[PDB]
């Protein structure tokens, strides 16, 4: 599917068997699940301490956690960061894995 | 051109006749020039007070300024926000104008 950017590009993905609406963000180097979302997952793996991320408002502490993402018939097994951010974002690391491309 | 997201999707655009490397960010609702970049523009228009933007680290104050952007043979005349952020970002407002699309 093609997102023309009239609205924020969001889609539902299954993370640890829980359908979540996520933002597809080419400006995010890495993917981050909101703490609220991490707490609603049907299954959770261990929490590994992380070393933060930065954005427009400064830096925020993170932890990392193992997840399985299902979308586009792919089963991706990776680590995602967790942080108190406003929305769950799929960044370049997972976007590359799913085959997403930005065309200008 | 197609960005496969192995690296941050950046490109050079001319803003007020000044070539700048900008980040193409589908996660940004609106475009923001860094203060450093605004100060290096060959030409600058008036500054209009704005009402901030938010991101991962909280909110940051902004002002808006009229600009002309040239890229892909288009001449776009619009307003961009200015703020002390780490990089200049072209968000959905300008991305839509240039015809960019994200494909998943
Ligand atoms: C972890 C992600 C980080 N990237 C980023 O923060 C860049 C990424 O596009 C982010 C997603 C947004 C969703 C947090 N975008 C923004 O912050 C943009 N905000 C908006 O559009 C808001 C959206 C927004 C705000 C509030 C609530 C929202 C609820 C739902 C949806 C959107 C929401 N609208 C407004 C009107 O306030 C700004 C750029 C215009 C990142 O890649 N960090 C890097 C490198 C880095 C370090 C320091 C500062 C950076 C600043 C920008 C990009 C990268 C930066 C890293 N390695 O840590």
UniProtKB/Swiss-Prot annotation, chains A, B:
Catalytic machinery residues: 25
Domain Peptidase A2 per the UniProt entry, residue ranges: 20-94
Bilayer-spanning residue ranges: none
Protein name: Protease
Organism expressing this protein natively: Equine infectious anemia virus (isolate CL22) (EIAV)
Encoding gene per record: pol
Portion held of the full protein: 81 to 184 of 1146
């Amino acid at each position: 599917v093609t997102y023309n950017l009239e609205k924020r590009p969001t889609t539902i993905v299954l993370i640890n068997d829980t359908p979540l609406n996520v933002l597809l963000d080419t400006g995010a180097d890495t993917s981050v699940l909101t703490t609220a979302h991490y707490n609603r997952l049907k299954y959770r793996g261990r929490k590994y301490q992380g070393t933060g991320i930065g954005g427009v408002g400064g830096n925020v502490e993170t932890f990392s956690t193992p997840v399985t993402i299902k979308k586009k018939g792919r089963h991706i097994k990776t680590r995602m960061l967790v942080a108190d951010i406003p929305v769950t974002i799929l960044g370049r690391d997972i976007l590359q894995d799913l085959g997403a491309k930005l065309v200008l």
